[PDB]
Amino acid sequence: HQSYDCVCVMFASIPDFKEFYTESDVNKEGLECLRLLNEIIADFDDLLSKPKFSGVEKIKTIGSTYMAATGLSAIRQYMHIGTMVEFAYALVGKLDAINKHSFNDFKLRVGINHGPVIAGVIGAQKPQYDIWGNTVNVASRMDSTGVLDKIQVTEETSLILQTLGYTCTCRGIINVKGKGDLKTYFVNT
Amino acid sequence: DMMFHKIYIQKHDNVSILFADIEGFTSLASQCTAQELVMTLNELFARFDKLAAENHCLRIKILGDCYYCVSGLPEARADHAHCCVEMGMDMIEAISLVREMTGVNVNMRVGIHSGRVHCGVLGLRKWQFDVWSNDVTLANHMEAGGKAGRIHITKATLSYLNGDYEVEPGCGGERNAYLKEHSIETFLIL
Amino acid sequence: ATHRLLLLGAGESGKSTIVKQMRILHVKATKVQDIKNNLKEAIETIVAAMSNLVPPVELANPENQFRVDYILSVMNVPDFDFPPEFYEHAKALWEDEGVRACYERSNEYQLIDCAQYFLDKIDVIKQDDYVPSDQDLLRCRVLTSGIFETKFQVDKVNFHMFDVGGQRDERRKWIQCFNDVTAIIFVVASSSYNMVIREDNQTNRLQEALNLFKSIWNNRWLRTISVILFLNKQDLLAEKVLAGKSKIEDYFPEFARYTTPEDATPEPGEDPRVTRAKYFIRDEFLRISTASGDGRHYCYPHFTCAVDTENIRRVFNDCRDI
Numbered sequence: 001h002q003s004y005d006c007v008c009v010m011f012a013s014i015p016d017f018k019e020f021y022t023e024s025d026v027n028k029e030g031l032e033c034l035r036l037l038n039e040i041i042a043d044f045d046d047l048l049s050k051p052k053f054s055g056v057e058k059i060k061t062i063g064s065t066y067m068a069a070t071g072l073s074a075i076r077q078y079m080h081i082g083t084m085v086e087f088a089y090a091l092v093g094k095l096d097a098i099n100k101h102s103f104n105d106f107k108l109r110v111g112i113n114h115g116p117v118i119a120g121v122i123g124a125q126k127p128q129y130d131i132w133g134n135t136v137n138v139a140s141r142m143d144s145t146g147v148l149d150k151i152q153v154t155e156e157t158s159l160i161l162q163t164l165g166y167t168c169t170c171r172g173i174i175n176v177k178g179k180g181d182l183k184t185y186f187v188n189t
Numbered sequence: 190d191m192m193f194h195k196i197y198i199q200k201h202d203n204v205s206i207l208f209a210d211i212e213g214f215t216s217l218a219s220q221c222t223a224q225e226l227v228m229t230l231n232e233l234f235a236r237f238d239k240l241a242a243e244n245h246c247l248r249i250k251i252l253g254d255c256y257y258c259v260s261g262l263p264e265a266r267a268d269h270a271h272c273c274v275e276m277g278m279d280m281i282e283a284i285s286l287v288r289e290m291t292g293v294n295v296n297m298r299v300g301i302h303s304g305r306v307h308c309g310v311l312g313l314r315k316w317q318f319d320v321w322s323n324d325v326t327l328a329n330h331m332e333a334g335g336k337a338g339r340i341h342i343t344k345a346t347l348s349y350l351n352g353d354y355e356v357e358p359g360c361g362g363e364r365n366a367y368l369k370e371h372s373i374e375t376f377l378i379l
Numbered sequence: 380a381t382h383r384l385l386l387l388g389a390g391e392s393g394k395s396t397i398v399k400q401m402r403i404l405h406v407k408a409t410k411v412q413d414i415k416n417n418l419k420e421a422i423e424t425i426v427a428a429m430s431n432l433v434p435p436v437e438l439a440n441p442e443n444q445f446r447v448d449y450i451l452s453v454m455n456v457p458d459f460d461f462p463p464e465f466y467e468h469a470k471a472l473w474e475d476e477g478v479r480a481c482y483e484r485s486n487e488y489q490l491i492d493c494a495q496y497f498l499d500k501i502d503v504i505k506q507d508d509y510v511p512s513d514q515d516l517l518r519c520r521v522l523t524s525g526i527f528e529t530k531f532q533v534d535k536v537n538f539h540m541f542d543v544g545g546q547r548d549e550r551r552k553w554i555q556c557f558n559d560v561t562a563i564i565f566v567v568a569s570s571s572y573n574m575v576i577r578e579d580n581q582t583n584r585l586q587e588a589l590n591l592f593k594s595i596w597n598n599r600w601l602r603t604i605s606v607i608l609f610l611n612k613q614d615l616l617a618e619k620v621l622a623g624k625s626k627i628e629d630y631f632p633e634f635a636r637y638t639t640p641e642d643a644t645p646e647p648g649e650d651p652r653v654t655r656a657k658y659f660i661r662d663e664f665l666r667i668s669t670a671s672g673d674g675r676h677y678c679y680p681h682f683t684c685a686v687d688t689e690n691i692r693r694v695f696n697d698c699r700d701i
């Protein structure tokens with residue numbers, strides 16, 4: 001496993017799902033709910049096979065959260081950052097589509113960040129590909145501490161996004177354990 | 190075929206779910222290099238994946254510094270309860286060797302629970318054998334509201350254990366707001 | 380040979396009423412309470428809506444003004460013991476021409492349908508030996524929150540009735556029944572064409588149905604599912620139609636052009652005006668089912684009356700041959 005210098009990590013969770021999930025006798029004991037999640041994850045995967053997103057590499061799916069890294073170049077020089085943002089919006093456009101036929105109002109919460117990461121595989125039994133590094137942590141932290149229908153990015157990230165054409169608003173200060181307090185911004189739409 | 194996408198998921202009962210997390214990982218994460226960690230990380234779970242096969246526990250997924258295998262899969266086993274306990278048992282000394290060569294205060298927080306679950310895969314890209322069930326969510330919180338170098342089991346995991354292990358009050362309520370909100374009685378393997 | 384039927388439709392469209400019939404056909408101290416509740420929550424609704432209406436409705440007997448105060452004082456009692464007084468006061472008000480004058484405008488404010496039914500019979504429910512008749516339970520009304528699966532059998536053939544909340548908030552639970560569903564039963568309050576939804580008090584109850592139907596019909600997860608259409612509440616429709624004061628063309632202008640179909644099969648001694656309207660509401664839905672969905676699913680109209688066991692027994696024998 002090698003180490004990259006500039007990889008854009010993104011997290012798009014759905015905090016509204018956990019409540020949606022319910023193991024009742026009628027829905028096959030939570031089985032039906034998962035079916036809806038399948039139509040969600042799948043719907044989000046149909047984007048990976050799209051020209052403009054040929055650079056987006058889905059890493060994994062944490063529960064009901066989507067994780068994709070843009071910048072691994074496999075499996076401007078910082079343009080992959082803006083692309084990742086376009087993938088975030090892309091997900092939104094599809095989550096809302098689901099609601100249309102689902103009757104829900106599922107809102108996506110995205111936290112994007114970029115920086116050095118260590119891509120590779122771990123686990124002897126069934127080897128799996130995953131990335132490591134402080135970069136991913138901050139990204140995640142900007143998802144668990146974000147806002148529905150909003151993308152939370154750090155300073156350095158906000159700056160680059162602006163050089164790309166995006167406007168950002170300072171949310172305030174967020175605390176990331178082991179890193180203290182940081183200043184995040186919301187990508188204006 | 191048509192309408193919806195074939196969901197590759199199957200229901201299961203009488204299984205034990207064990208969650209484990211590195212207590213204070215940022216502790217050494219601020220000491221060891223970004224790479225040294227990934228090594229220790231890969232080194233630890235390595236032994237884990239092997240111990241699991243020895244204790245008959247199936248590896249589910251690795252989340253950073255969180256590792257969780259479930260017993261009773263694929264082939265049903267009425268020994269599931271012990272399998273996880275056994276896992277947590279050996280798992281610990283595996284994270285202790287992390288004190289010898291690296292960061293101190295490194296211990297595992299085992300959180301075991303039993304009940305039905307839903308295993309399989311979602312979406313249609315880079316499938317990841319995962320589980321879904323409130324029982325699974327409970328094991329998670331159990332792990333969260335656990336104690337260093339100790340095993341945190343619920344009331345269900347204790348019944349499936351035929352009381353072959355000596356336990357004690359867990360007080361998970363005053364630990365996790367979930368084990369509290371749901372009025373859950375927790376114990377700790379002595 | 381076990382079918383899974385899912386009942387869809389807007390709120391108070393008449394879903395739970397149909398399931399009751401299925402239990403009365405192919406299949407109390409506890410419900411009595413509710414019946415009284417429907418009666419209370421009924422009368423108090425009319426009176427309270429007299430001063431708010433524009434123009435405001437005034438009583439015909441100033442005396443009852445006191446009874447009006449009584450009803451408005453116990454409008455929010457936790458466990459109303461329903462004392463002998465209530466009934467006397469209630470009926471007294473219901474008899475007041477002014478109150479009724481306000482009843483005819485029950486479309487200008489949220490009011491249950493069992494109002495007329497129960498009020499006309501206060502002397503029966505006031506009794507201590509009161510025994511709810513099949514019709515009383517069919518006329519009763521209780522909000523359905525969640526999903527309930529009824530299991531009955533007809534001529535040695537298993538069915539699976541599915542009752543879900545027809546209220547906007549509840550509609551999010553429907554999905555849990557979209558997969559592996561034999562047929563969908565879409566109930567509609569044909570009579571509620573001059574009333575507005577309860578969710579916001581501004582969205583037409585019939586339009587809500589139309590939009591809702593269109594959503595289910597054109598749903599990505601129901602491409603091959605055929606939906607039967609129960610244009611329920613035909614009794615209340617024909618009534619309002621014969622009334623002549625709540626013109627339909629004043630809520631749906633397209634009705635000014637509409638002309639009764641030549642393939643129309645009007646019931647015996649059925650007023651031509653009713654026929655020219657009962658079908659109008661039907662065609663409004665057919666256009667939605669004709670716009671798309673071809674060969675993969677169809678729609679089957681069925682004028683119905685959920686509270687009429689003699690009607691649902693008929694129309695249902697048809698839903699079986701489909």
Ligand SMILES: Nc1ncnc2c1ncn2[C@@H]1O[C@H](COP(=O)(O)OP(=O)(O)OP(=O)(O)O)[C@H]2OC3(O[C@H]21)C([N+](=O)[O-])=CC(=[N+]([O-])O)C=C3[N+](=O)[O-]
Pocket residue numbers: 132133134135136137138140141177210211212213214215216218222223224226227230252253254
């Ligand atoms: N939502 C998430 N999605 C994916 N990953 C997450 C997520 N949240 C946290 N992590 C990763 O997991 C580690 C756990 O962090 P955290 O939960 O705060 O702390 P502890 O382990 O200490 O447990 P405690 O909270 O005290 O009970 C972090 O260490 C690291 O990346 C982080 C990290 N870092 O934060 O900087 C650097 C590192 N290397 O190698 O440099 C390795 C980690 N790791 O392996 O997990």
Ligand SMILES: C=C[C@@]1(C)CC(=O)[C@]2(O)[C@@]3(C)[C@@H](O)CCC(C)(C)[C@@H]3[C@H](O)[C@H](OC(=O)CCCCN3CCN(C)CC3)[C@@]2(C)O1
Pocket residue numbers: 017018019021062063064065252255319320321322323325326329
């Ligand atoms: C799908 C429905 C539902 C309700 C049921 C379920 O079993 C979960 O998928 C588990 C429990 C389950 O899959 C075990 C792994 C994990 C990751 C623990 C999932 C998440 O907590 C889900 O929710 C979330 O995505 C929100 C919480 C995420 C926080 N986790 C906590 C644990 N650490 C280790 C990683 C981050 C989950 C709870 O969602």
Ligand SMILES: Nc1nc2c(ncn2[C@@H]2O[C@H](COP(=O)(O)OP(=O)(O)OP(O)(O)=S)[C@@H](O)[C@H]2O)c(=O)[nH]1
Pocket residue numbers: 388389390391392393394395396397491492493517518519520521522523543544545546566611612613614615683684685686687
């Ligand atoms: N007059 C008349 N009343 C009817 C008819 N069908 C149903 N009702 C009455 O309408 C009221 C509402 O019916 P109900 O079956 O509760 O609606 P619902 O679709 O189940 O509504 P919800 O429960 O999801 S919000 C009940 O009081 C019932 O007795 C009909 O055809 N005519």
Ligand SMILES: [Cl-]
Pocket residue numbers: 388389390391392566567568569571584585588
């Ligand atoms: Cl309706």
Ligand SMILES: [Mn+2]
Pocket residue numbers: 210211212213214254255
């Ligand atoms: Mn940890």
Ligand SMILES: [Mn+2]
Pocket residue numbers: 210211252253254255
């Ligand atoms: Mn962790």
Ligand SMILES: [Mn+2]
Pocket residue numbers: 394395396521522523542543544545
């Ligand atoms: Mn109902």
